[PDB]
């Protein structure tokens, strides 16, 4: 206690009096730091500012912090409250949702235009059925290599939606024409179609895969940004 510190003995006078610490100093319990004054909405407050360790997922870290804090809250003194004054994760979550909505919209629009050109529901369903397969397989493959779900890889997926349905559109369109041209059964007609269009399929795939390949070999921050688009798109085209 401060009283004990007030009583520390210091020296003795020639007359005989005993000099204590209170005789020369003022003792009180104060701060160990007097260089900051923090307020919240104009009212006195205390602040903790957290920085992430390099290599950590911000959303994960923020969830863990809120968990630990909610645990700690149970022993607050009467009258203590807290509140996030500055926080970045709302924007991150919002922008992920933004990209996902635009991806769904992309799919719907592509289906509509394919219907505009393939006038039937049967013809229309085949290139549509390709989308789930290629999207989900691409996620599986790129996760094998450590790529996450971020804004860039989702942009790549949206950009790919309109390329992955290509080989399918070519195939289905050749079948429909062949079936119309010589009226033959779907099975025979299809065998004839593939024999016609295999070279075009390979050429399409080769060019679209090749354009995005050199991108994956640049260094720096720019190379890291590039690799997302590169790897995602390459996997999408091979899978298609």
């Amino acid at each position: 206690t401060p009283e004990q510190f007030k009583n520390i003995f210091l020296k003795n006078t020639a007359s005989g009096a005993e000099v204590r610490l209170k005789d020369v100093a003022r003792v009180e319990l104060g701060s160990d730091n007097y260089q900051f004054d923090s307020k919240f909405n104009g009212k006195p407050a205390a602040g903790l500012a957290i920085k992430i360790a390099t290599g950590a997922n911000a959303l994960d870290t923020a969830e863990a912090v809120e968990q630990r804090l909610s645990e700690l809250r149970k022993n607050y003194p009467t009258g203590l409250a807290d509140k996030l004054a500055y926080d970045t994760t709302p924007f991150i979550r919002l922008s992920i949702e933004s990209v996902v909505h635009t991806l769904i919209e992309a799919v719907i629009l592509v289906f509509i235009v394919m219907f505009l050109f393939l006038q039937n529901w049967r013809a229309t369903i085949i290139p549509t059925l390709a989308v789930p397969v290629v999207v989900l397989g691409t996620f599986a493959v790129i996760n094998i290599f450590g790529f996450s779900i971020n804004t860039l890889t989702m942009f790549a997926m949206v950009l790919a939606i309109g390329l992955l349905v290509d080989d399918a559109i070519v195939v289905v369109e050749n079948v429909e024409r062949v079936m119309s041209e010589d009226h033959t059964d779907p099975v025979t007609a299809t065998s004839r179609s593939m024999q016609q269009i295999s070279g075009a399929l390979v050429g399409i795939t080769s060019v679209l895969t090749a354009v995005f390949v050199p991108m994956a070999f640049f260094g720096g921050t720019t190379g890291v940004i590039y690799r997302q688009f590169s790897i995602t798109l390459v996997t999408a085209m091979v899978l298609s």
């Binding site: 100093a25 407050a45 903790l48 994760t89």
Partner: protein, 144 residues
Amino acid sequence: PGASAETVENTVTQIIEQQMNGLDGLRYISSNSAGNGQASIQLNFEQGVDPDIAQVQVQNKLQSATALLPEDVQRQGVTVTKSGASFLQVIAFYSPDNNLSDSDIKDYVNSSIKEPLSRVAGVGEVQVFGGSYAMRIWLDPAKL
């Protein structure tokens, strides 16, 4: 302690800088020397350099650097840290009803909250605003 900014730059900042010239994937160095007596040197690295390897290498060079320093500096200690500039969050602690004092809130944040939060997974560093309790002995030079 006690040195002017020029003395700090000449005697501390420059020699440590010279030692760091020759790290593996170094991109640029930024340093400042202050007149309270402090020196700060921030080393930036190329993309794809492993942070832990960079830290160990910086310590390996600092080991020999620290003998070339003024003996008082040596007594003070040198620190090595890895951290980023941006804050992920800021939490505000306050008394909505004004029935817990500010000294108490500040102390409570420092004694019961700061350490457990700085040990959550992913947190790299915690910066606290408002100090903890201390026993303050304020002297009267007339009575001394």
